[PDB]
Amino acid sequence: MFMINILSLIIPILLAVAFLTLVERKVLGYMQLRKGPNVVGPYGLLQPIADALKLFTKEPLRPATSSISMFIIAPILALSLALTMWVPLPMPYPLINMNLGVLFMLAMSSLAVYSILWSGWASNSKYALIGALRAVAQTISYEVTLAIILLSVLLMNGSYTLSTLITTQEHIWMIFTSWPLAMMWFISTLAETNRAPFDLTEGESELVSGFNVEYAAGPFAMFFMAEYANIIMMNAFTAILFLGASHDPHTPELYTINFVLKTLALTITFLWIRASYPRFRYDQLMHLLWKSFLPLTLALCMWHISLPIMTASIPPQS
């Protein structure tokens, strides 16, 4: 039955990734006064299927100068970690109920960083190398900021368990409690997922597709799937962490509906931001977190250490 549960977690996530591709296309079109895909099927519903079939029936090539061993591993690692990030999320019952349900997320994200690095380096191309180093810098910045922000927010919670996050947010919302950390965390999630205005590793205007310049057909589709799965997963993480839904043990479907609605709202906000804003410059992104977010993040961490102690509201350990 556990294998059935794993499949039920995996396959709908990939379906949601494909239809998120479609939704982003249409949302950007209507924000840009276009229509978006509406020809392939009824309201363009078959467009993701057409694109997937085309990509997996098209020829993939390996560059002559490429290191083939790490050329193949990078999409495998990216997709595997994108799917693995979904196992501890409670909706409202996690597939795997990890006691430290957040450090696993941090470690797997840091490991998923290396997929783009190894794809860029293995490609043996200058644009891929530039994209890889942009990934290095972006990872530095968002890693330190994410670590401190998450520490503070979970310090308001009591432990590193997401079901405990639900129980904490039973009455009110962490967005109400700690909205500055929430805004900085949203920016950090944008940077982590490489979405605009921080799409530096794959900046089309400055680089020709960045790290995946040499990737075509199936391997490229795996990078796209991993990116969109990470987008949805991080939006779900933000929704669980800051927008806590009410949970009824006897009818847990209501929590699932609320969680999915919040996740969709955050993902549509991601697409909205991409449509609205220009692109950063990676040195300006590094100076944005270190020189603006990091000082305020340290101050807010001190404040959120002191607040439960000074108000006699330290959360229960269990």
Partner 1 sequence: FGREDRFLNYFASMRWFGGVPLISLGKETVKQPVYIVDVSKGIINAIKDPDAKGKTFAFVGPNRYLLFDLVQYIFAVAYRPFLPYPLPHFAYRWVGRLFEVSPFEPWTTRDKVERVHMSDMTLPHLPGLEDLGIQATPLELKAIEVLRRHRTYRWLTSEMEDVKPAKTVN
Partner 2 sequence: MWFEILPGIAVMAACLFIPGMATAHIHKFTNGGKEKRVAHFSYQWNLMERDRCISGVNRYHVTKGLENID
Partner 3 sequence: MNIMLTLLTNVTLASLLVLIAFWLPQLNAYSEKTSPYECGFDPMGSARLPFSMKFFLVAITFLLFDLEIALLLPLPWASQTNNLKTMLTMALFLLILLAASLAYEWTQKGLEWAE
Ligand X SMILES: CCCCCCCC/C=C\CCCCCCCC(=O)OC[C@H](COP(=O)(O)OCCN)OC(=O)CCCCCCC/C=C/CCCCCCCC
Ligand Y SMILES: CCCCCCCCCCCCCCCCC[C@@H](O)O[C@H](CO[C@H](O)CCCCCCCCCCCCCCC)COP(=O)(O)OCC[N+](C)(C)C
Name the residues that contact ligand X, by CB under 6 A.
Answer: 62, 72, 295, 298-299
Residue 67 binds partner 1 (CB under 8 A): yes
Residue nearest to ligand PC1 (CB): 99
Residue 84 binds partner 3 (CB under 8 A): yes
Per the listing, tokens 């972006």 go with 138
Minimal CA–CA distance to 212: which of 113, 80, 123?
123
Sign of the CA dihedral running 240, 245, 250, 253: negative
Give the binding range for ligand CDL (CB under 6 A) out of 8-16, 17-25, 74-82, 294-302. Answer: 74-82
Residue 65 binds partner 1 (CB under 8 A): yes
Residue 175 binds ligand Y (CB under 6 A): no
> Least CB distance from residue 198 to partner 3, whole Å?
16
* Rounded CA separation 21/74 (Å): 21
* Rounded CA separation 310/251 (Å): 38
The breaks in the chain (C to N more than 2.5 Å) occur after none
Query: Which position among 21, 66, 178, 209 is part of the footprint of partner 1 (CB under 8 A)?
Result: 66
* Rounded CA separation 58/68 (Å): 19
Q: What are phi and psi of 272, to 5 degrees?
A: -60, -45
> Least CB distance from residue 39 to ligand CDL, whole Å?
37
User: Which of ligand Y, ligand X, ligand PC1, none is residue 57 near (CB under 5 to 8 Å by kind)?
Assistant: ligand PC1
Residue 73 binds ligand CDL (CB under 6 A): yes
| Residues 114-133: x where in contact with partner 1 by CB under 8 A, - otherwise, as a string | ----------x---------
User: Where are any strands of DSSP class E within the chain?
Assistant: none
* Rounded CA separation 189/142 (Å): 8
Find the DSSP H helices in 67-125: 68-84, 103-123
Which pair of tokens denotes residue 210?
């960045």
> Least CB distance from residue 249 to partner 2, whole Å?
6
User: Which of partner 1, partner 2, ligand U10, none is residue 108 near (CB under 5 to 8 Å by kind)?
Assistant: none
Residue 11 binds ligand U10 (CB under 6 A): yes
For ligand Y, the closer of residues 33 and 39 by Cβ is: 39
CB neighbours of 23 closer than 8 A, spacing ≥ 6?
267, 268, 271
> Least CB distance from residue 274 to partner 3, whole Å?
25
CA distances from 165 to 20, 90, 245 (A): 27, 10, 10
For ligand Y, the closer of residues 21 and 267 by Cβ is: 21
- The interface with ligand Y within residues 2-41 (CB under 6 A) comprises 39, 41
* DSSP one-letter string for 250-277: S-THHHHHHHHHHHHHHHHHHHHHHHH-
Query: Which position among 208, 254, 257, 265 is part of the footprint of partner 3 (CB under 8 A)?
Result: 208
Q: Is 7 left (phi over 0), alpha (psi -120 to 50) or beta?
A: alpha
- The interface with ligand CDL within residues 39-68 (CB under 6 A) comprises 67-68
- The interface with ligand PC1 within residues 97-156 (CB under 6 A) comprises 97-100, 104
> Which SS3 state, helix, strand or coil, does residue 89 take?
coil
Residues lying near partner 2 in the complex (CB under 8 A) = 1, 4-5, 8-9, 12-13, 15-16, 19-20, 22-23, 26-27, 30, 35-36, 38, 42-45, 86, 91-95, 97, 99, 161, 163, 232, 249, 252-253, 255-257, 259-261, 263-264, 268, 318
Residues lying near partner 1 in the complex (CB under 8 A) = 64-67, 124
